[PDB]
Design a protein around this ligand. Structure first.
Ligand SMILES: NS(=O)(=O)c1ccccc1F
Ligand SMILES: NS(=O)(=O)c1ccccc1F
Ligand SMILES: NS(=O)(=O)c1ccccc1F
Ligand SMILES: NS(=O)(=O)c1ccccc1F
Lengths: 261, 265
């Protein structure tokens, strides 16, 4: 991969792997999500960032992830992904992505993520300071560059809390070592897989996932156990909730949109 | 990737990904195992295979893994390039074997090696059979004629008999279930998930203070999508060795057994 000519964005090509595809012989949404995280980490490395504010014990954390896929790439196909960041004042930052078929050059998908500033110890959120905002802006486009430009778009919709009883459920989900990152935290993509576990297999077999919006409220520790809840709100639409198996503490909520194959 | 000059083996380079590494900032053994499976599948595609030959397909016959043996000297770091060479060989009527050599692309040194034993089985009845002469003929043309072993040694670890763990196990991890990401394109649990499940019953302290050097895993029975597994481990031993057993959470039916060797970091 490499930064573009202006140095304000980053592109990388990936060849789809055999173990990365599902029953349709095309990449799963978790393979897509992993590739988005990888090109994001590679963009961070290219401009000197770690996966000045380290002394204050301050980190960026994901609050929301929104992904829309038009075509999933097949095993052996090449996918090109362009990514870039932008500041949103004191709320936090945003990382966007565009996915293209390397052969046709057509847009096959797009994604956007909202990130907030928090203390690594204490987990307390904060507004972004001017000192941080200054050294961040030099690696971003100055004029707004949105993967989802449309006024009143799906990526900015408020998500409601699922009411008991859920229509569907998958209980007792636990992360294994493969679900952790190099810093021993559960990888954000595992939460997507856990959300989708409560979708019935018949919907998976007859529909393709088109849109997924996921809010990240609280981290799942290594020794925690999660319950995945899903209720049909409708094309098929679902409302999702991930909560701790015991006390019911919310870790995530989201929505998915599926189209008939 | 590409087949070598003689067309009897296949090489491929991989750049290690951020989500593929562990706490040591180096690839996990499951990332290594996935790369071995990927270069194997790419070698199959390069010479016109699904691993089923044209004769196996009509008879609903498939190759299935019976044993996987991996030895790692150095795990590659995030951003490093690893080169993997793979090849197959027939073992008469017992079945076939797929071997691999892992090298650092920069230094050219061997950083690891692996070997796997495969048996012929009917896809539907799950009944094993000996390799027919007709299948051995169209297989041989894609393999080296002279023996080429990743583990040549006279007393190598890859061919050792594995005993069954006795209750009570020293360590255990209970109620493990595959999720959709653990399945392959054919909806079967990916062989690498079983490695992850075996390692789940190793205490976190051993992981934190030791590097895994050798793993030998026997595959007795497949875990279905709706099955639940228990992972059991007992210390058998500066080097630490363990005996492993994966069995169904209910009736205790054995799915896998194996051994691991770990060295102090
Ligand atoms: N925004 S992120 O952390 O790169 C991310 C990527 C993919 C899935 C979920 C995520 F949160
Ligand atoms: N914070 S970050 O994801 O390392 C980053 C990487 C590249 C450009 C701007 C950024 F903010
Ligand atoms: N021999 S195999 O199927 O390529 C394989 C690769 C990696 C782990 C376990 C395995 F069984
Ligand atoms: N059976 S297989 O894994 O498709 C195979 C691939 C390449 C060479 C020889 C082989 F036997």
């Amino acid at each position: 991969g490499s930064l573009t000519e202006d140095g304000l964005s980053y592109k990388e090509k990936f060849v789809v792997r055999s173990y990365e595809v599902g029953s349709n012989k095309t990449a799963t949404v978790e393979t897509i999500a992993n590739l988005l995280q990888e090109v994001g980490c590679n963009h961070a490395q290219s401009v000197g960032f770690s996966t000045t504010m380290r002394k204050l014990h301050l980190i960026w954390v994901t609050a929301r992830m929104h992904i829309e896929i038009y075509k999933y790439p097949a095993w052996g196909d090449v996918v090109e992904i362009e990514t870039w960041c932008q500041s949103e004042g004191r709320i936090g930052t945003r990382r966007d992505w565009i996915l293209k078929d390397s052969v046709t050059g057509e847009v096959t998908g797009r994604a956007t993520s909202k990130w907030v500033m928090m203390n690594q110890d204490t987990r307390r959120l904060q507004k972004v300071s001017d000192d941080v905002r200054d050294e961040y802006l030099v690696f971003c486009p100055q004029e707004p560059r949105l993967a989802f430009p449309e006024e009143n778009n799906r990526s900015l919709k408020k998500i409601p809390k699922l009411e008991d009883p859920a229509q569907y459920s998958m209980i007792g989900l636990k992360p294994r070592r493969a679900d952790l990152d190099m810093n021993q935290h559960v990888n954000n993509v595992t939460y997507i897989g856990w959300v989708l576990e409560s979708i019935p297999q018949e919907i998976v077999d007859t529909h393709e996932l088109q849109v997924i919006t996921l809010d990240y409220r609280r981290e799942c520790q290594q020794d925690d156990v999660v319950d995945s809840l899903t209720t049909t709100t409708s094309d098929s639409q679902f409302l999702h909730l991930l909560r701790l198996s015991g006390d019911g503490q919310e870790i995530n909520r989201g929505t998915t949109l599926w189209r008939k194959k």
